[model samples]
Target chain A: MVPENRRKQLAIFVVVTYLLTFYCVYSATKTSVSFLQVTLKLNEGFNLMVLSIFILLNSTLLWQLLTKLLFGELRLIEHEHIFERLPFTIINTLFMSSLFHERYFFTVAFFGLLLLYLKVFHWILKDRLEALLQSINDSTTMKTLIFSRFSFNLVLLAVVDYQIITRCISSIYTNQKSDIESTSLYLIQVMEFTMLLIDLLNLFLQTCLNFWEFYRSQQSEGKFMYEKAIDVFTRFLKTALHLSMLIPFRMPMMLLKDVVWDILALYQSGTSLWKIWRNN
Target chain B: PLVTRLWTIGCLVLSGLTSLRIVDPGKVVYSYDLVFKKGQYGRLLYSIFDYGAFNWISMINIFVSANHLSTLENSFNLRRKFCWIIFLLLVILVKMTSIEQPAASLGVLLHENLVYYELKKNPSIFPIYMNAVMYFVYKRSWLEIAMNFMPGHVIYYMDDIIGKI
Candidate 1:
């Protein structure tokens, strides 16, 4: 049982994360420094700092926590913090050893996978087998579900890592005169590549799941060419702009169908303001 | 806790040693080329705290970095504090390779990344400071026209005043 104190703390702390999401998302760029000074005159100027630099860090965590809370799925089982974190060291060593060059973008990945692959080994144990089966009911814990999603993501990263490293090695060998800067630029490109590649497929599969709902609306609403077209366009536009601000501000494609289900109810219903309030 | 004290002392002492001509800026700065090519890694640790030009500007930067670093250290936990510091060291090293190859190169990056992770980890301890000394006004950006932009990305936020939970 989660301590009552601990539960309320989760509530209060989650509110802070919500502020981090809303406050930083819209104007994370122009919003921080002078905005505070101009608007509130708070802090001796120094205190008004914006951690929007790592907005990606908080935003990703924010998404998981809110979804977990909204879904009411945390079962209070995250006791072994060591096993929870060791996978970062494991996967990072795997990358460094296999890729033949060091990489430093793990903070982004780490923040996303705070509830990392502990279950990868743990589930193989007899005690943890029921733990794996419980999430199959799709209702006990957040990390249990998150582990599966992020495992898919890591496998994808491993694939892209192999592709990028192989191509870069081939290029270096062929050009023989290739120097540090070119090799370094290839490293940069790999980050950009994996981020984009994963973000696309992320939103792709995510949006595809939402397509299930539209088909229901299609049959339920009775024959729907124009409605489907307009609905898809609006949802697609929202996802696209979400990518834009996220690239400039928020990050990574991690949202899924339930959020979009509310979004459809949000716009299609006559009372959007109510739905948005319900959004929280 | 002592990590913050030792770091603050290290910066003040080493930066002044450079100011006193004990070591030139080349010796003061930590570059990948210098460390690997010339093998000058002995002085690499000092460069993390080595900021200031005998003025309030560098001092302000130092204090800001120290406070945030300490805040993050406390907020996270003592068990991970050493990892935070050393991982921070490893992070700044990566930055200087293809990253900088400037102002106290490691110092500014340390300060920036310190606040970066602080806000990243445990955000929402916003404080309202009454009488604040204004320091470090950076450009808004070429893409936008707001001249009074500040450099600290997680701007106007507090250290760990309310983040204990």
Candidate 2:
């Protein structure tokens, strides 16, 4: 009953937070949006809706965190299900990705790369979860199920990665330059980058929760059944720690590449950066 | 086609895994229900994200490809070529289906509720209309609005850059 009470309060917290977040987004961006309309000739509804989605995304993240804190537990199935929102996610990905791809093929390739990244995330967890579950039972039947699960997840992830990458690479092969080398492409690129970044963040959180569910399952098996929860939890924690650590290096590599890129651009300008720096 | 089918299999595997996740040595349905209850939110979120991406990409491709076809038609002095026109129409159909996802959802709901609800009173139709309108608005505004921010001249040179590659 007490736990149920906590759930009720957490639900209320989620609703209130989302409402406030929505209102804040509308108020804060309305002025600058009009300015962009004048400066960039932006369309009102399209621009605002795009902005609002990001706001909604951030708000969703906030609510998930808040629910965790208030309930003092992971609000798994109890939270509002997002499965119903899949059609929406798929729609948005196609729409927004196409928008970017139309302007620059590199952007399409980038998204394809991101999809591969998602496939990797899905596979890694699937492998670990199946391993842990199967390790528990040495029975022939259970062993087969475990191996099957591992194989199936592996193949699925591979196929999805292939689809994304092939689509991207094929588009490039079909028409490389018209897709890639446009001069006045900054504004669209900025918007595209923002969408990609936001989507990446969302993927990160959602995938982590999937792993968390694996951890929770292990815990439950330990509690009522004779399974050892300690080992499973440790493995789960270890994976989480490793993933979080990977972010720093991954991010910096992108920045370092950007610097090298700028230097190359300077060289292409026919006057080296050193010459320009020495003169100016 | 092969890849799509494989991915579908993966979806089925994951969905089945959801059921299996609940498989405790103790009970079947109860265990399944417990796991489902726990995962409902995460699963829902996953589905929504999936839905949004699928529909959005399909819609974009439809528009872009249509533009490509129109350009082709104009470049050649062909008076609305027939074969290509039919092909374009098929693509348009595919595109419309992607755009009308809410309609698909509503159709399923209506089928489920057929015993009780009449066709005219079906509330799901509203969402279908709303989504179709919203998709077009977004599609139209995207070109007009996003175009202004793009540097057209650089785009020309970029064409050569793309051509060289």
Candidate 3:
């Protein structure tokens, strides 16, 4: 059961995450500064600050999602805390592996599957989250759901930070053009292939019977909580829909969509790790 | 909360002070109510400066106030109010600055005519009218003028303070 005292902790976590996300988005121009050096030909140190800011913004979003969506709300059935974080861990590893390559059509294809998978996952998981929310007998289940979400989200966020940091670090390696063994490249390829297969499977699961597990639990609630949650959920979904429509019109946004590109490029080329191992 | 109240109070103060001077016809010669028989150089400059500077100050004020309001607890009301106000100010600033090109062209024409008339020669200063209009309307050419016209533009001037590092 979620102790009433824990509610305060939850509130504080939400507030901090929201503020941090706001600050990151608002202050992201500082991160864009690294473009001055990476692409714009400026001093390395100055550019590094900008790179850090970029990673920071991505990190903040991950943190927010983990805390509120995963941990607090959608606390899933699990063996332990470790089991709860597995989904996030798998997704994050996919993200890291995806970072090592330049061919992005595969990534785009993967996201198509991921979006479908998440939608199904949400559908299947909806009942569990609702059951936890509705059952007044004990708050333990709800607390577990919330924490699971938080832990999973943290894993995802950590992966994003890893990619961004590695990309920036690898730029130095790339500029130096050190000898990279063919075996390293082969390893990267194998890792990416495994990620691609998992991503494809995720898409398949989403397409087939994505959220059957959760959909069973959507019992009608009092007009207030049900309506409010539905309203918020609808708005969030609508935003996603509207943004999807923009995918064609806004080429740059779509092009930039593959956040995994730079990381993958660095990793695939074997230049990124080489630089890290050599330089630092 | 504090900053929003401060702006509300500040706007009131400005309106009050301006009213006292504007009411006394002898003290201030020019008023917004009075129009020139035709738009003169002074009228043009004054109009540009009036709207431009007012809206500019409003933009700066909103940005500064927003920054302040961000730090407080129970600031939802203040933040919402300030967000709307800032949006309104931005709209006004954009509208005011959008007029810069025509204003500058007209103002420059008057000065040039005076010069040409005094020298008794044709003024050579001319740009393609259609292109200029298209550029201003489509490309937002006047935006640069508005952006550049600020006496102490923070975005540009901050570079010096921020320095090479």
Candidate 4:
């Protein structure tokens, strides 16, 4: 591995060069054709070339770094497997991007999509690496790692929801009334509602999966699996509560929706239980 | 560390001066000149402090710079304290001569340059914003800066301007 300093310098150099080219492109768009041509002929072209080579050289380095940081490096996942996850990631991106259609919200949402996409890719890749992870002997540390990952993902969801809602409210209130504004505001509201449902479903499924893991770990060295699952559920509820407080005015509607949704989920579960009881 | 503390206090005082109406922030912003004039030399102290240091935005710069300088001084004993002072003085000089805003120039020198170099020295401290920048810079994405905290955006644009320079 390269020395940390060298890596940092390289990162900075690449960032700066990319920014310069971006600035040139931005400025060129604002200028006349002749001026843009002259500027493009200057050091800008060289700057862009350097940026391209730097990106090409370090693309693998960054991909590996990001993956290692997000998912533990013990299990090697193929690029093909990662790439295969893109369509699923893109669906999430489309869903995320629907929250913002103008100005800073759109920009923020776009980056948010990219970040979320990367996480989705990691999730998909890690699904294949589960067997390797399960082979680790230190059950305690593994449980801790799993909970921490869950906690982080929970927080990420909460923060994104808060930001989207806040930005949505502000944009809708501040903008002048127009057809575009009205439509975007409507889109944002619908998207936010869907996001609420999706996030809730994810949290419910995650908690259920943790409980399933606990049940399976009963006779093994996974003694703490039950506690870990409970801990994750507690943390998820806490985060969800905090997130709900961020929009207190909407809490009533949200609570009502959650109540109805949970009732429906419980009714479905009750039907399965009743059927089992009758058959037995 | 003591110097950094005092610098932070000094910046707060400068910001307080503005808040209290003792100093006009508008007057403290840097001005660009097309021609060098001898008459401006008379108010060199005023130009240095008023335009470069005493503004509200400069307050943020001072706090950030002072903290960064302290870290550098503490971490790298290879450089003397005098060298650090000289470096800052040189930064101020650069700000005085540049067409860019004074606070922005200081921000660039400190956050973009010094902090960037420091980030290289200790990769452990690299923030997630850098990751966003890495991914989005090619696309000329506004989120390159917007994804960052507000202060982070301030530092980023400052760096961007200085990089262009």
Candidate 5:
């Protein structure tokens, strides 16, 4: 049986994911004046597509949550079908990837990387990618939910990513043509793009290492506990590294609370260390 | 569970009626009755239907609070359920008495309920709530942000703060 806390975490994750999905829809559909004309422009069809997907995702998530909360029929997460999370994972990745303006080209590159990552992930698990696809396809609700969200996410992620990249490229071109202010803006754009590239690379590496220990656990019964512990530690380290890189780019005021929290945490750890030293 | 569901439906029905102009919101809503003074038994009755229950957005608040209550009751003892209802009643009473927008306060109550539920599950979620605070602070669009975060204004109510303590 799954541990009770783990089950609760899964439920919370599902709820939060559902919430973020709706936020994406709201951002896409909401009428807002753009400071940059080229940046915010989008096709009419694209807007409708995003709005429709927003409704679809929310309704499904709502139904699922109601069943879980009201009737206690579903637990949101089950141990055996941990792979059931792939639909959501794929859906989220695509949703993020779809936001690019030059989505057609990004779509090609994004899927290529996605396939490569999945291949590496599957190999690390000693499992076939087809097994996951087959499992989802076998169930009607799973099939519809997975494919529809997958398509929507893909489009959304692609469109957004393309838009950002195109804007960066155009900004750079304009900056190069001009002299002073544009030069600084161009540098900032370059820095942003470089940071994004580093992030993507870090993600790829993290995914590979995360699954490496799971592969070991599947291979031997006795070593399972050790492998899982190491995997957990590595995952935590990976997350810390990722967050550290990203946080510097954010506004100082925005990160003020986090800084305070970190200081408090450090102080507590330091006090504990001093006590340990004195006792020894 | 039944009480939560029925309350949600009642709120929705009242909202629909008000929107259709079958019922007048101005005549029914009691703003600052507690501070301003009142003993109208009929207005008290109308106050139940007055708390922005007629708006479409209220439906989300109703659904959310009921869900939080259901989750809480599922995990904790039945005795605490009474406490939950009492707290909610106290909020509504104070809101009806002093607050100009009880409907928005109710929405804030729903948000607070969900926050408390999550807090009980994981104190680690406090940072996430802090992040939401930053988002609310930094938001540029008044109407858009208000629409999204207006209901959360219920946090300013002294009743909620003391009740949480």
Candidate 6:
């Protein structure tokens, strides 16, 4: 039997990339964290560090113990089997989301949003993967599962976009100085911009899915699975393309607006020169 | 034994010194405008390495990282102090799209994670599940770490493809 090491190698690829990406977001915001918009000061920074560190250590131990008791092997669950337990994970996410809404509420919500982003990163693929792979022969669960997935993602989008707009708009609403009056605060908050951008893509999907008799119609007895895979795969690619554009330093709409301005300026300058030489 | 310990050591000493009030963290921590325009060169090095404010919580942080760092350092054969040296000079070399990264351990954690993945893949008898699970388990770094990079970046990668394996 051949030894499989790529799984471990890629796992490292993921965590390492994510760890750096999280820090990338961290410094950009300075301290604004979570739906609560709680900016971590030095004191909480230490506390949160401790919170996360212990969480990782114990969580590592917990997983190790569970593995020891369960399969008795370090690896080898396989992917499809991995998605088999998908529903419970949603429940785990659902309950976990609500739990954060109450207690200490503000500061604690920091990591809640943290893990929220982590879970958010995962679900689209999982939800899509599960959808494309299966038939709705298990009707009620399928209906409810997708319903919950769609419903949860909206609430999730709303929570993140709340900060994206409220804080973002307010920051823009204020002028740094009347003299300078630059639209400065907007650029650095690209972190929030991306979520708002995500909401845009998400809304399009929701809209596209609705308002169609074909979509709302009943499930087919024959091969409806092909449409799903095609739709899902197409949607995945579209979302990926649009999303990569959202990553940083470029805003499509903003660029379009600026291009018009430049065109106007170029034309106006030419006319101004024309009038200077020949007319008043 | 402690050869892989420089980063953790820097964090502990910095945290300890801050605890002692020998210097203020405000002087050292990351602030982009201050770092770039105002000329606070101090942050260039110390910004990420020091975890900030020694306390009971920091003890756990040090412990977690120390354990992982040692694990990474030990496993690969011909291990002659290779990890952190590359981490500092060549690797931390990359900057993000907008803001500079904050905190040393954040990078260390990622480096450890990437390493944990890369290292675990290298010729091992172990099948490797709980190894990456440690990184997966604690998705709670968002508090101290800003949670923004993922809001859009969430779609940027094939994590759904990458993570499950």
Local distance difference test values of all predictions, in order: 0.46, 0.38, 0.38, 0.48, 0.45, 0.46
TM-score of the first chain alone, every candidate: 0.26, 0.33, 0.24, 0.41, 0.26, 0.32
Superposed by TM-score, candidate 3 places the C-alpha of residue A253 at a distance from the truth, in angstroms, of 2.9
Best model number under DockQ: 2
What interface RMSD do all candidates show, one decimal each? 16.6, 13.2, 22.7, 19.1, 13.0, 11.2
Write model 5 residue lDDT over A205-267, tens digit each, in one string. 443443454455455633333334344444444345435643644523324643565456556
Candidate 6, after superposition: displacement of residue A90 in Å?
A: 24
DockQ of structure 5:
0.06
Q: What proportion of the true contacts does each candidate reproduce?
A: 0.00, 0.46, 0.00, 0.00, 0.00, 0.00
Per-residue lDDT of model 3, residues A1-280, tens digit only: 3578677766676676567645644455455656443344322333333344444545555655754655455444422443454454444334434433333423443333333334334333444444434553432333455545633543353454346335534643564444232223323333333333333333334322313323344432233333333334433343344345335334233235443453344354354335444544
Candidate 6 residue-wise lDDT, A73-126, digit = tens? 322333344455554444333433333223333433343344444443344434
Select the stronger candidate by TM-score from 1 and 4.
4
Best by lDDT: 4
Q: Sorted on DockQ, highest at the top, how do the candidates line up?
A: 2, 5, 6, 1, 4, 3
Please give the range of 10 consecutive residues that has the lowest summed lDDT in model 5 chain B.
B144-153
Q: Residue B122 CA error for candidate 3 (Å)?
A: 44
* Model 6: residues with Cα > 4 Å off, grouped in runs: A1-149, A178-186, A199-280, B1-72, B76-165
**How close is candidate 1 at the interface, in terms of C-alpha RMSD after superposing the true interface residues?**
16.6
Error of 6 at A272 (Å): 45
- TM-scores vs. true structure, each candidate: 0.28, 0.25, 0.20, 0.31, 0.31, 0.31
| lDDT, candidate 6, B19-68, per-residue tens | 65667666766554556665665565564466564554445545555566
Query: Model 5 — interface RMS deviation?
Result: 13.0
